[PDB]
Amino acid sequence: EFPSICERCLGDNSYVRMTKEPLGQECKICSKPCTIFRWIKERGQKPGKTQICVGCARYKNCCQSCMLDLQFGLPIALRDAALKLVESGPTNDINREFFAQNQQRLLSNGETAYDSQEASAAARNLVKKVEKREXXXXXXXXXXXXXXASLNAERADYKIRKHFEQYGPLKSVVCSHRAKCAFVNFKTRSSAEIAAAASPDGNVLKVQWGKXXXXXXXXXXXXXXXXXXXXXXXXXXXXXXXXXXXXXXXXXXXX
Amino acid sequence: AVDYNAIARQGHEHGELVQASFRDLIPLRARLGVGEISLEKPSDEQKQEVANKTKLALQKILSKQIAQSQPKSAVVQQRDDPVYIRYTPSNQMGQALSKQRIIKMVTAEQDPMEPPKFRHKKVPRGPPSPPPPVLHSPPRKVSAQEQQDWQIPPSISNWKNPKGYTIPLDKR
Amino acid sequence: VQPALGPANPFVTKEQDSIKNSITGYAEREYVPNFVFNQEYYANTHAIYGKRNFDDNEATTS
């Protein structure tokens, strides 16, 4: 009557000494008395311990320590969100006691197994589901501000970090999705000057030199930059957005 | 009715004696498809099988009741045979398959003192085993005079008439 | 022996095929004298350390 326990934790050795203790911790999920099973994995490793009761790790199907699902190797939360196989959902203090007791009530009476064919069919389906989803006037006005180390990246964060870090020593990087912009600040100006000319008109961009109510104003600026990008590719809201676009530049210049 | 009587049986974990058809209300003298009616009271060699089955079963329960009832102060027993085992793993993620791995179980021997390790959580009991067919005799005719003859006049007190509910003095 | 006979279910993934007493793998009782198990266990560990050590450390001798 040894425990669930995956192959992954038992470890490198074939022979394994381990101790039961018939009534240690009540299970985390189940919240009822169970048996603790302790063992060592490696030479000077701190020893393992089963965290769940078997009644649960039947239902949930995982290494009574590792909790990585037996079939795949991904976490149990990660699994239930993506694959959505058994579709469990208590996630409470008290409801999760009964719900998880109710599944132990279900499986014990009628042995409803964890079917692995239909499980694997969910994965290969999810894999295919991922693939289907998937300038002169500037530099002059820019040089006028340069004479009188930050680049405004107009028109995701990791790629903004990747493409700019490879062109010099970075001070810091920003982004706002609603803003739809990112201020890349360099340690030196020699890098920021070089990165401006390199990343001008590039995919992953307008690379210039940088300079309740806040939510509605920024969400208004999102609809303004969306129609601004749509028009250049190709009426009252477009004119009203132009009036708002002119009003912001007047406040920026005056201040 | 061939594939439907497996609606009343569902669940139960023990439902082969459950009734289903009208046949079940039919006396054993008329079932039609019955060889012989046995009224005798089985045997002695079953009597002594059963009595053994029951008595062994109760004893395993009574023993375990006595175990929980008394905590057995200082009475600490060492099931001190290292139980050895072999564990054949079932291609879990993939990769290495078998080997067989000999586990060696041992019982860590509980400190005499430490008091109980968990509280008594009280949770509402689960729902019962779904019910069976009712199979009553056919409902008798009632009539409107009969249902009037069981008319029950609401009684009213001389003393205990709480709340309000005023009642005229010609109804007393 | 008496084999099963039939066409064999074709779908059968890796996870179903093994006979498992307790989810991960079949588990059964053993009766090995402990001295053999303790003796066996140490030799296995040295090999594991040796790979991590990367040193064979020669053979055991008199």
């Binding site: 074939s14 022979y15 | 072999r86 054949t88 080997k99 067989q100 791995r101 000999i102 | 006979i19 079949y26 059964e28 053993e30 009766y31 090995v32 004298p33 053999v36 198990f37 066996e40």
Partner: peptide, 20 residues
């Protein structure tokens, strides 16, 4: 000493007692 009836369980594994 006490006697009992039959049974003769089959082991899934082969090979000796200590190895695995």
């Amino acid at each position: 000493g006490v006697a009992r009836p039959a049974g003769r369980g089959i082991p899934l594994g082969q090979a000796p007692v200590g190895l695995a």
